[PDB]
């Protein structure tokens, strides 16, 4: 575990942030802007589920047809280096209290035992979110907690606004 909260940054494609996530993490949970059937059709979802290939699409299947759908859920990630996938659900549309429930979902991004990990900007198509609001609730609900979290977006303006408030 590291002494104190540490982040790191990247923008670009899934490939780039994981190659990076294995070179200075070297074990990792990557989190997953989820649904709550778990299905993985589109956004960094699609980019995850293409990554980690079909067992770990199927095990999200398989799980749901269980147990219904989910707010959270920790998979197997199939991937060497990849500790898991963390599936995290934000608020839906027409949530209120928006600030509230994303620190929430943020704070749903821990697992236990696990001190790395790759985390996108949640919730950036939810009635009512925007990525200020969104890395503000994620800064909030990791504050205090020691381990390393590699924030990550396919847009520079997220992560200048990460460092900006820095």
């Known amino acids: 575990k590291p002494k104190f909260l540490e982040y790191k940054?990247?923008?670009?494609?899934?490939?780039?942030?994981?190659?990076?996530?294995?070179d200075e993490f070297k074990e990792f949970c990557i989190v997953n802007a989820a649904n709550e059937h778990m299905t993985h059709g589109s956004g960094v979802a699609k980019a995850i589920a293409d990554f980690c290939?079909?067992?770990?699409?199927?095990?999200?299947?398989?799980?749901?047809?269980?147990?219904?759908?989910?707010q959270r859920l920790v998979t197997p990630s199939f991937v060497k280096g990849i500790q898991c996938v963390n599936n995290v659900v934000g608020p839906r549309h027409g949530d209120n209290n928006l600030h509230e429930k994303l620190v929430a979902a943020y704070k749903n991004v821990l697992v236990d035992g696990v001190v790395?990990?790759?985390?996108?900007?949640?919730?950036?198509?939810?009635?009512?979110?925007?990525?200020?609001?969104s890395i503000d609730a994620m800064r909030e609900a990791f504050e205090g907690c020691t381990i390393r979290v590699l924030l990550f977006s396919l847009?520079?303006?997220?992560?200048?606004?990460f460092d900006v408030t820095c």
């Open 9 to 22: 940054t990247c923008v670009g494609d899934l490939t780039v942030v994981i190659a990076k996530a294995l």
């Open 53 to 70: 290939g079909l067992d770990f699409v199927e095990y999200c299947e398989d799980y749901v047809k269980k147990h219904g759908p989910q």
């Open 116 to 133: 790395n990990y790759v985390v996108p900007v949640l919730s950036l198509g939810i009635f009512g979110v925007d990525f200020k609001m």
């Open 155 to 161: 847009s520079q303006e997220h992560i200048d606004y």
